C-alpha cells in the first residue's frame, strides 16, 4: 500500500496503453475487456461517488466567500474567460484540420447534394427538490442550490438573534465536515490510480487502439497534436501573462489532467479537480464555482475535436468544405451544445447532430460510413479533449482566483 | 399505552398463530389478509423506516473505532465466522434430509450467469445520496466506513477550523444514529400488535399446507435449526465465555422479529439495539450486523439442504446420498450474498434445477417445486430467525475478542 | 440460404450475415462502416444479380425442357 | 407417439397413473357399452364398423386433433 507517487501512475500509463495497443492487436480486446476493464472501473466508480458531495458540499463553503462579487463576479469573468480560450480552440482546430488533410483515402464521395428551448433547459437549472437533484445525479441543478444555500447561511450569521447565528454555524461547519472529508477519500482513491489508469488506457488502447491507423490515424495527428498547441500556446500564453508560473502549474495539475485523460470524463474528475486547486492553494469561494461551471461550459475540446473531424467528414465524402467558412459549421456545434459538453461521447452525438443541420442525414450509407470510422476512433479522440479541457479548467480557476 | 414487556409479545405470537391456523382452516385466509395482514405491515413498515438512517449514521460512528484494523479485523474473522457456521449449517441440514425422508408421498417420477465483478463494483456507489435514498444496504456499508475513516483523520488536522467542523459532523451523525435507536423502542411498543397479526396472516395463508409430506419438509427445517441453535451456537458462545442463556435473554427481541418480519435486514434495527443494549461497542455492531444480514448463509444452507432433497427424492431419485453436498454447497456459493431479502430461498432452489438439469417447464418438477412455494414462508421464518441468532452470535463473539 | 434468395435486399443480409461467422460482428464501427458502403451500393448490385438469376432461370428451363 | 411416450410417458406412473387407467378404459367402455350398442341397435354392424373406421381412429389418437 506504499511506493513511488505520481511517477506510479506514469508507470501505469505508459504500460498500459503498450500492453493493451499489442493485446487487441492479437485480437484480444475482447479477454482484455472481460478481465482488466473492471480495475479501471472501480477507479472511475469510487471517483464518481464523491462527485456529488465534494461538489455540493464544497460549495456551501464557497458561499462563505462575499456573495454579491466573487460569485457574481468571476462567473461573469469564468464565462467570458471560456468565451475567449473556446474562440483560440475552434481558430486552432480548423488550422490544424488545414495542416493535416484527413479526407485523401477517402475519397469516396456520395452525392448528396444536401430542437433544444433553452427557456426549458434554463428553467431545469432551478431544482424543483433539492434532495432528489443531489440523488438523482444532477450537477447544475446541485451547483445552483449550494450557492443559494451558503449564500442564505451568510444572511443568517448576521442574524441578531443568537440561538439563529448559533445553527447557522453548526450547519455550515458540519457540511465543511462532510466538504473536507471527501477530500480525504479522493487521496484514498488516488492510491489505486496507477491500477486505474493502467487498466484503462489499456483496454481503450485494445479497443480503439488498432483502429489509429491510415486516414484515421491522420484526424487523431491534427487532435492529439492540435491540443498539445492549445496547452503551449494558449494557456501558457495566460498563465506567464498572469504572473502563475506555467510549469509550477503542471506540476500542481499532474494528477488532475492524468485523471481526465483516462476517465475521459469532465465531471467524473472534479473531486481529483478540485483537489488539486486547494493544493494549489485557489479559495473554495472561487475553484468550487468554477470547476463544476467549467466541467460543463467547457467547449476547448469539442471545438477542437469537431474542428478536425467535422473536416474529415466534409473532405472525405470529397467536399470543398467552403475553406475559410469552416468556422460557420464549427461554431454552430459547439453553440448548439455550448453547456452539457461534460458526459464521455457526447463529441460524437454533436458531430451527428451536426450532419442534420449540414443536409447529410446519417441515413445516407456513406455518409453514415464515415461517421463510423470516427466512432472507431472517438475515445482516443475524447481522451485528449477532455484532459485539454481540465487544463483548460484549472487554467481559467487560476487565473481568475489570482485576480478577484 | 402500557402493560407488559415481551410476554405482551409472545401473547401474540400465540394467540395469533392459534387464530390465524383456526382462521385459514374455514377458508377465511382472504379474509384474514384483507383485516389482520395491514396491522401486522404496518409494524414492518415503520422497522424498514429506520434501517438506512440506523446503519448509516451508526457506521459513520463505527469507523470512530481504530480503522486499520478492528474495520480491516474483524471484517476478516467475521467472514471466517460464517464459513465455519456455515459448514456447520449445510452438514445439520443435510443430516437432517436424511433423518427426516421427505419423498415419500411423492413418490411421483419424471425422467427427466452472474459477473461477481460487475457486482463487486455495485458495492462502491456512485453517488452516496441516491444509495441512501433508493435503499441499498451493502453500498452504503461502504460509503460509511470510508466516511468515518476520513473523519478519524480529519480530527488530526493540524488545522483546528478543520477539527472543529470534524467534530460537528460526526456528533450531528451520531445524534440521528442515537435518535433512531430511541424509535427502535418507540416501534416496539407496537410489537405484539405486529407479530399478532403477521403470524396471525402467515399460518392462515400456509399453515393448512403444512401437512402429510409437506410437513415432513417443515420437521426437518424446524427442529435441524433449533439444533443449530442449540448445538453450534450455544457451543460456540459457551466456549468463548458469553454466556448462552444469558444472550437468548438479551437476544429475545431481535429473533423474535426475526421470525415474524421473515426479512432479515427488515430487523436490523431491532438487532442492532439488542447489540448496543448487550454492550458491544458501535465499532464492531454496526459493521458486522448489516454484512451479516448480506453475507449470512446458516439459513438458506439448512432450508435449500432438506428442501433440495424433497424435490430430488419427490421426484424418485437416488439425490446421489452423501453427495447431496454438491449441489448444496453450489447453491449457498451461487449466492454467498444477498440472502436478505423474503423469499430469495425459494428463488435459489428454482435456480439450482436449472443448474441440475431439470428445468421448471417439465410440468412434474414444476408440480414439487410448487408444493415448497405453498410452505416457503413457514420455512423461510426460521430460516431467518435463525440467521439473526446466527449474527449477534458471530458479533458478540468477534466483539468479545478485538 | 439455398433457398429464399428471391426476396430484394437479401444478399446484403446474408452478407452481414456471414461476418457473425467470420467473427467480425457488425458492432466493430469499422466492420460497420464498411459494409455501410456496400449498403449505399447494394441496388445496383442487385439489380445484375437478379437479371442474371432470371436468365439462368430460363436457361435452366430451356435446357431441361429441351430434354424431358 | 414416439415423442409422445417419451415426452408424457414416463409421467404415466404412480397416483398420475391412476387418472390414465380411469380414462383409457373408462373410454374403452364407452365404445363398447355405448356406441357398439347404439350399433347393434341400428342394424349397422359394429365389427365391420371398426374394419372400416379403423384408419379414422389411429389417426385421431395420434393427431390427438378432432378437426385435423
Known amino acids: 500500500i506504499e511506493y513511488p507517487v505520481l511517477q506510479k501512475i506514469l508507470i501505469g500509463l505508459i504500460l498500459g496503453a503498450i500492453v493493451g495497443l499489442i493485446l487487441g492487436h492479437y485480437g484480444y480486446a475482447h479477454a482484455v475487456h472481460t478481465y482488466v476493464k473492471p480495475f479501471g472501473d472501480l477507479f472511475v466508480r469510487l471517483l464518481k461517488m464523491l462527485v456529488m458531495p465534494i461538489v455540493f458540499a464544497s460549495?456551501?463553503?464557497?458561499?462563505?466567500?462575499?456573495?454579491?462579487?466573487?460569485?457574481?463576479?468571476?462567473?461573469?469573468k469564468i464565462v467570458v474567460y471560456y468565451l475567449l480560450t473556446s474562440a483560440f480552440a475552434v481558430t486552432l482546430g480548423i488550422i490544424m484540420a488545414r495542416l493535416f488533410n484527413p479526407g485523401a483515402g477517402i475519397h469516396l464521395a456520395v452525392g448528396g447534394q444536401q430542437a433544444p428551448p433553452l427557456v426549458h433547459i434554463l428553467l431545469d437549472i432551478v431544482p424543483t427538490n433539492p434532495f432528489g437533484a443531489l440523488a438523482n445525479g444532477q450537477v447544475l441543478p446541485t451547483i445552483f442550490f449550494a450557492i443559494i444555500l451558503g449564500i442564505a447561511i451568510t444572511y443568517l450569521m448576521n442574524s441578531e438573534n443568537e440561538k439563529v447565528r448559533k445553527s447557522a454555524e453548526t450547519l455550515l461547519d458540519a457540511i465543511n465536515g462532510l466538504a473536507e472529508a471527501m477530500y480525504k477519500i479522493v487521496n484514498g482513491v488516488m492510491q489505486y490510480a496507477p491500477i486505474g489508469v493502467f487498466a484503462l488506457i489499456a483496454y481503450v488502447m485494445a479497443e480503439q487502439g488498432v483502429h489509429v491507423v491510415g486516414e484515421l490515424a491522420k484526424v487523431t495527428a491534427a487532435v492529439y497534436v492540435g491540443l498539445t498547441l492549445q496547452i503551449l500556446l494558449v494557456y501558457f500564453v495566460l498563465?506567464?501573462?498572469?504572473?502563475?508560473?506555467?510549469?509550477?502549474?503542471?506540476?500542481?495539475?499532474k494528477d488532475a489532467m492524468l485523471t481526465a485523460f483516462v476517465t475521459r470524463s469532465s465531471s467524473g474528475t472534479l473531486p481529483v479537480t478540485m483537489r488539486v486547486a486547494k493544493e494549489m492553494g485557489i479559495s473554495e469561494g472561487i475553484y468550487s464555482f468554477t470547476l463544476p461551471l467549467g466541467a460543463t461550459i467547457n467547449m476547448d475540446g469539442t471545438a477542437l475535436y469537431q474542428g478536425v473531424c467535422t473536416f474529415f467528414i466534409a473532405n472525405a465524402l470529397g467536399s470543398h468544405l467552403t475553406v475559410g467558412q469552416?468556422?460557420?459549421?464549427?461554431?454552430?456545434?459547439?453553440?448548439?451544445?455550448?453547456?452539457?459538453?461534460?458526459?464521455?461521447?457526447?463529441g460524437a452525438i454533436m458531430l451527428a447532430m451536426v450532419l442534420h443541420s449540414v443536409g447529410l442525414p446519417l441515413t445516407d450509407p456513406n455518409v453514415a460510413a464515415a461517421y463510423a470510422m470516427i466512432l472507431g476512433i472517438d475515445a482516443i479522440l475524447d481522451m485528449g479533449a477532455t484532459m485539454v479541457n481540465v487544463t483548460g479548467d484549472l487554467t481559467g480557476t487560476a487565473i481568475?482566483?489570482?485576480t478577484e
Not at 59 to 76: E, F, K, M, N, Q
Open 239 to 253: 498563465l506567464k501573462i498572469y504572473g502563475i508560473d506555467p510549469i509550477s502549474f503542471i506540476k500542481h495539475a
Open 59 to 76: 460549495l456551501v463553503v464557497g458561499a462563505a466567500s462575499i456573495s454579491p462579487a466573487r460569485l457574481g463576479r468571476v462567473g461573469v
Open 400 to 402: 481568475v482566483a489570482k
Open 326 to 346: 469552416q468556422l460557420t459549421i464549427v461554431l454552430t456545434a459547439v453553440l448548439a451544445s455550448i453547456g452539457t459538453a461534460g458526459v464521455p461521447g457526447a
